[PDB]
Amino acid sequence: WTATSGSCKGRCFELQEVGPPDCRCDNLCKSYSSCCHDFDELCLKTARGWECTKDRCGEVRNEENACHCSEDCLSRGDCCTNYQVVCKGESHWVDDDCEEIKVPECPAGFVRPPLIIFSVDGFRASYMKKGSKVMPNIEKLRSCGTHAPYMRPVYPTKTFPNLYTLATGLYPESHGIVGNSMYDPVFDASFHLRGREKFNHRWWGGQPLWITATKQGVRAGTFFWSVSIPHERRILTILQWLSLPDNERPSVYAFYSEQPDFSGHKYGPFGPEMTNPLREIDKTVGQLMDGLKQLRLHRCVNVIFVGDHGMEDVTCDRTEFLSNYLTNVDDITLVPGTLGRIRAKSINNSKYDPKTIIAALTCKKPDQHFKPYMKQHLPKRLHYANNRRIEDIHLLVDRRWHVARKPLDVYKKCFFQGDHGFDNKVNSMQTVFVGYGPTFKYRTKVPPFENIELYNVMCDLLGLKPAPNNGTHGSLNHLLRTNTFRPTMPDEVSRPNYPGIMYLQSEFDLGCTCDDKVENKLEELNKRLHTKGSTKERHLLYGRPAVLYRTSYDILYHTDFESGYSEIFLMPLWTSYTISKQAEVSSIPEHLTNCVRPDVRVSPGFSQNCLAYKNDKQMSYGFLFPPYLSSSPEAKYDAFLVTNMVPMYPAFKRVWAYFQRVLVKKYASERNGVNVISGPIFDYNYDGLRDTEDEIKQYVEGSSIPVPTHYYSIITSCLDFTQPADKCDGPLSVSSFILPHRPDNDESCNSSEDESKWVEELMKMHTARVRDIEHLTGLDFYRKTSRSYSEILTLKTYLHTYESE
Ligand SMILES: *[C@@H]1O[C@H](CO)[C@@H](O[C@@H]2O[C@H](CO)[C@@H](O[C@@H]3O[C@H](CO[C@H]4O[C@H](CO)[C@@H](O)[C@H](O[C@H]5O[C@H](CO)[C@@H](O)[C@H](O)[C@@H]5O[C@H]5O[C@H](CO)[C@@H](O)[C@H](O)[C@@H]5O)[C@@H]4O)[C@@H](O)[C@H](O[C@H]4O[C@H](CO)[C@@H](O)[C@H](O)[C@@H]4O[C@H]4O[C@H](CO)[C@@H](O)[C@H](O)[C@@H]4O)[C@@H]3O)[C@H](O)[C@H]2NC(C)=O)[C@H](O)[C@H]1NC(C)=O
Ligand SMILES: O=C(c1cc(OCC2CCOCC2)nc(C2CC2)c1)N1CC2=C(C1)CN(C(=O)N1CCn3c(n[nH]c3=O)C1)C2
Ligand SMILES: [Ca+2]
Ligand SMILES: [Cl-]
Ligand SMILES: [K+]
Ligand code: NA
Ligand SMILES: [Zn+2]
C-alpha cells in the first residue's frame, strides 16, 4: 500500500527515501509504483524543452519550465545546461582547448573533488575509435584524461552482474548477482528483470560504493534512475544536487544510460542505426560538462565514463537447441541465451543425472557452438562457481550464438541482431574506461585492466577505505596523479628449512628404482655447490615466493631448478627454473624411463613412494622441472628426484608433456629466454582459494599423497625482448595458466589428434593472472625485483587473452 495523497512540493528528487505507506518523490519512486500524486507535475517538468534560446535570455522566471534562462537561474542552480553559452557568450566545454588540471579548482565550501560516474550500457570498446567522429565530448574526455584501450568486464557479460561488480569490486560469485536471471534454492526465490523480487536486499551482497561512502560520512547521490526519467532531467537533477548547501550536498553521483545497449540488441553492434544513439549519449555528456562549467566545477570534479560490457552480432538463426541433443529435454530447466545454466526441473525426480546430461552435450556435432562444463571445471579466470545460485551444469556458448531448450522458445517469445553475455575475454564483450579530472592523469593511456579493480579507485578518489574486495589495491595507481594507495608487501608467514644430506639410500623403502649406479674431485665440489644454491640466481630471478600461511617446507637447490617442497602435501608448492633462448631439448633416455630417486635431504616419512602409483590404476606421475630441459646428462638425474614428482592422470600427462617438451622451448625462443614457476593447486571446494589439508577429496590410492585439482605455470621474461630473461633491466612480461587436472580430455573435442592440434588451445582457454595463482596457493611472487611495488601489482593482475587486436 502507498498513500499517494501526500505531495512532492519541495521534495523533488529528495535524497532520503521515505518508508511506506508514505508517498515517495525520489528518483526510483516510479519503479515501485509509489510516487506522490503530483510527482510528474512538480518533478518531471518538460515545458519549453531542455535548451535556452536567444529569446528566453533574461526571461521572467516561469516555474513551469523544464529549465530556466532567467537571471536568477545560476543562484537557484536550475539553468538549462546551455544557458551561459546562449545568453552570456560562453563556449561549450567541448570547444575549449584541453588544459592540464594540476590541482582541483573548486568553489569555496567544497571539502574534496566530487566524483561523477557516467555509466553506459553495452558500450563496446571499439566504439571509441569507430564512433569517434560523432562523439566529440567523449573523445575530449578520452584524449585529455586517462583512458584504457578497453576494460575487461566480468563473466557473464550481462548488465546486472557487471554494474554490481563496478559497485562492489567483487566477482559475481561473491556479490551474488550471478546473472540477469537467478534461482536461489535456499530462499526458494527467483530474481528476474521484470518484477519486484530483484528489489529485495537479500540478493545483493558485498558493500557497494554508495554504502561505503555513507558509512564513512561521505554523502552519495541516489545511483539509480527509473527508465521513464529522461536523460536531460537526470543531468539537471545532478547539477541541482551539486548546488545544495555544503552539509547537504553529495560528494559522489551516478548517471546510467540504457544506450547504446538498447539499440545494439535491435540493430547489431555496428548497425547503421547505431550512429544516432552514440550522438545522443555524446550530447548528454556535453550537457553535463557544460553544466559543470556553469557551476565552475569543470576543473574540480573527477568524471568516470565507463561501460558494463560490449555487444556482439547474434541472430535467431544462430541458436543451438538442447532438444537436438537430449532425449529427456522436459526434465531440465535451462537459463538460456549467450550462456546456459541447467538444473533439474523437479527436485523430486530421482532419475535426474548430471553425468548423462553432460555426456549427451559433449562433442556431439562437428561444429557444436557451445561446450558443457561442470562449474568447477570452468576456467578459473572466470571465477564463476562459488555460489549456490550458479547451477552445477554450465554451457559456455560460442560468440555469435545462443543456446535454447527447444525451437518453440525462440519464436513463441527474427527480432534481435545483437547480444552479450559471452566469455569475458571475447573482444566484442570488452568495454570502456575514461577518467578525467584533477585526480586522474593528463593525456595518459593505461593498459587494459579489469572492472573488478575500479571500486578501489573510486574509494581512493573519495578518501574512503574500501570494503574487502577482489581488486588488487594499488594495481591501478598508475591511473592517478594523487590519492595513490601505497601498500606494503604481505609478510612471509612460514620460513623455509634448508636441509642438507641427512638420509642414507637404504633408509628409503619407496618401491622406486633407477638405473643411476654410475660413478672425480673436479666435478665433486661442483655438484656440492649446486646443491647449496650456487646457480640459484639464474633459476630464481625474482626472489623466492613467500608462503603466506603456516606450514612446513624445505628449499631444495639443484643445478637446473629450485623448489619449495611441502612436507605436508609431499610435493613442491612451487618449482622455479630458467630456460635460455639457446637451451636444448633432449629425450628421457631409455634406461631412465621409469627412474625415480630418493632425495637424501628429505625423510622417507615426508616423501612420496612409487608403490602407491603402481597400485593406483587410475593415477600416474609427472615431474615439475622437466627432464627434457636438463642442462646435461648428469644434471638430468636431479629431475627424477622423488621430490620433483607430482601425481598426474595419464590423460593430463599428454597435456603436461607437450607443454614441457615443446612449448617451454618455443616460449624461450620467442621471448628470449623464460623463467618458469610451476606447481600444484588444490581447490576442491572451488572457492578460488588454497585448500587446507582437510578439504582434499582425493589421494593417490593407499597413500597420503594429495591429488591436485589443477597445475599452474607462471612464465616470465623481459618486456624488452632484446634483453634475455635472466639479464633484464626493466619491466617484465608474464603469461600464466591454471590447467585443470582432469582424468580425461573430454573438454578438447580434437584430443584424439596429435597434441600439436589441441593442447595449446586448451592452455589458452585456461590462461590466468598471477594473482589468481596467488589466491589458489597462498604464495606471493615477485618479492625481489628492481621494479616498484605498484608496477608489480599491475603485472600480477595482467591476463594474456590470446584474442587478436
Ligand atoms: C573476493 O573477495 C571477497 C571479499 O573479501 C572474498 O570473499 C570473502 O572470503 C572469506 C572466505 O571464503 C569469507 O569469510 C567467511 O565469512 C563468514 C561470515 O560471512 C558473512 O559476513 C560477511 C561480512 O559482512 C558478509 O560479506 C558475508 O556475505 C556472503 O554471504 C551472504 C549470504 O549469507 C551473501 O549475500 C553475500 O553475497 C556473500 O556470499 C558469498 O560468500 C559466502 C561466504 O561468506 C559464500 O558462501 C557465498 O557463495 C558467496 O560466494 C556473510 O553474510 C564467516 O562466518 C566465515 O568463518 C568460517 O570459517 C572460518 C575460517 O577462518 C572459521 O574460523 C569458522 O569456524 C567459520 O566456520 C563455521 O561456519 C562454516 C560454514 O557454515 C561451518 O562449516 C564450520 O563448521 C563453522 O561452523 C568466513 O570468515 C567472506 O565472507 C567472503 N566475503 C564475501 C563478501 O563474499 C573472496 O574470497 C574473494 N575471492 C577470491 C577468489 O579471492
Ligand atoms: O539504474 C540502474 C542501475 C545503475 C547501477 O549503477 C551502478 C554503478 C556503480 C559504479 O559504477 C558505475 C555503475 N547499478 C544498478 C544495479 C547494480 C546495482 C542499476 N539500472 C540498470 C538497469 C536499469 C536501470 C534498467 N536495466 C534493464 O532493465 N536491463 C535489463 C536487461 N538488459 C539490460 N541491458 N541488456 C540486457 O539484456 C538492462 C538495467
Ligand atoms: Ca579452496
Ligand atoms: Cl543470466
Ligand atoms: K598408476
Ligand atoms: Na576429447
Ligand atoms: Zn543488453
UniProtKB/Swiss-Prot annotation:
Carbohydrate-modified residues are 3, 348, 360, 470, 750
Where is this protein localized, as stated in its record? Secreted
Region: Nuclease-like domain, residue numbers:
541-805
Q: Which GO terms describe its biological process?
A: cell chemotaxis; cellular response to cadmium ion; cellular response to estradiol stimulus; estrous cycle; immune response; negative regulation of cell-matrix adhesion; phosphatidylcholine catabolic process; phospholipid catabolic process
- In this chain, Zn(2+) 2 is annotated as bound at 261, 265, 420
- Sites binding 1-(9Z-octadecenoyl)-sn-glycero-3-phosphate sit at 159, 180, 261, 420
According to its UniProt record, which residues of this chain constitute the active site? Answer: 159
Q: Where is this motif: Cell attachment site?
A: 76-78
Please state the Enzyme Commission number of this protein.
3.1.4.39, 3.1.4.4
Q: How is it modified after translation?
A: N-glycosylation, but not furin-cleavage, plays a critical role on secretion and on lysoPLD activity. The interdomain disulfide bond between Cys-363 and Cys-749 is essential for catalytic activity.
Residues bound to Ca(2+) are 683, 685, 687, 689, 691
Tissue and organ expression note: Abundantly expressed in cerebrum and cerebellum. Localized in secretory epithelial cells in the brain and the eye including choroid plexus epithelial cells, ciliary epithelial cells, iris pigment epithelial cells, and retinal pigment cells.
Catalytic activity as recorded in UniProt: a 1-O-alkyl-sn-glycero-3-phosphoethanolamine + H2O = a 1-O-alkyl-sn-glycero-3-phosphate + ethanolamine + H(+); a 1-acyl-sn-glycero-3-phosphoethanolamine + H2O = a 1-acyl-sn-glycero-3-phosphate + ethanolamine + H(+); 1-(9Z-octadecenoyl)-sn-glycero-3-phosphoethanolamine + H2O = 1-(9Z-octadecenoyl)-sn-glycero-3-phosphate + ethanolamine + H(+); a 1-O-alkyl-sn-glycero-3-phosphocholine + H2O = a 1-O-alkyl-sn-glycero-3-phosphate + choline + H(+)
Q: Where does Zn(2+) 1 bind?
A: 121, 159, 308-309
Which Pfam family, any one of them, does this sequence belong to?
Phosphodiest
Tell me how the cofactor is bound: Binds 2 Zn(2+) ions per subunit.
Q: List the disulfide bonds.
A: 8-25, 12-43, 23-36, 29-35, 52-69, 57-87, 67-80, 73-79, 98-144, 106-300, 316-414, 363-749, 512-610, 514-595, 718-728
**Effect ascribed to mutating residue 159 to S:** 15% of wild-type lysophospholipase D activity
Keywords on this record?
Calcium, Chemotaxis, Cleavage on pair of basic residues, Disulfide bond, Glycoprotein, Hydrolase, Lipid degradation, Lipid metabolism, Metal-binding, Obesity, Repeat, Secreted, Signal, Zinc
Q: Which domain of life is it from?
A: Eukaryota
Q: Which residues bind 1-tetradecanoyl-sn-glycerol 3-phosphate?
A: 159, 180, 261, 420
* PROSITE patterns from the UniProt entry: SMB_1, SMB_2
Per the record, the domain comment is: The nuclease-like domain is most probably catalytically inactive as residues that are essential for catalysis in the DNA/RNA non-specific endonucleases are not conserved. However, it is required for the stability of the protein and the catalytic activity born by the Phosphodiesterase domain.
Q: What does this protein do?
A: Secreted lysophospholipase D that hydrolyzes lysophospholipids to produce the signaling molecule lysophosphatidic acid (LPA) in extracellular fluids. Its major substrate is lysophosphatidylcholine. Can also act on sphingosylphosphorylcholine producing sphingosine-1-phosphate, a modulator of cell motility. Can hydrolyze, in vitro, bis-pNPP, to some extent pNP-TMP, and barely ATP. Involved in several motility-related processes such as angiogenesis and neurite outgrowth. Acts as an angiogenic factor by stimulating migration of smooth muscle cells and microtubule formation.
The family note in this entry says: Belongs to the nucleotide pyrophosphatase/phosphodiesterase family.
Write down what this protein is called: Autotaxin
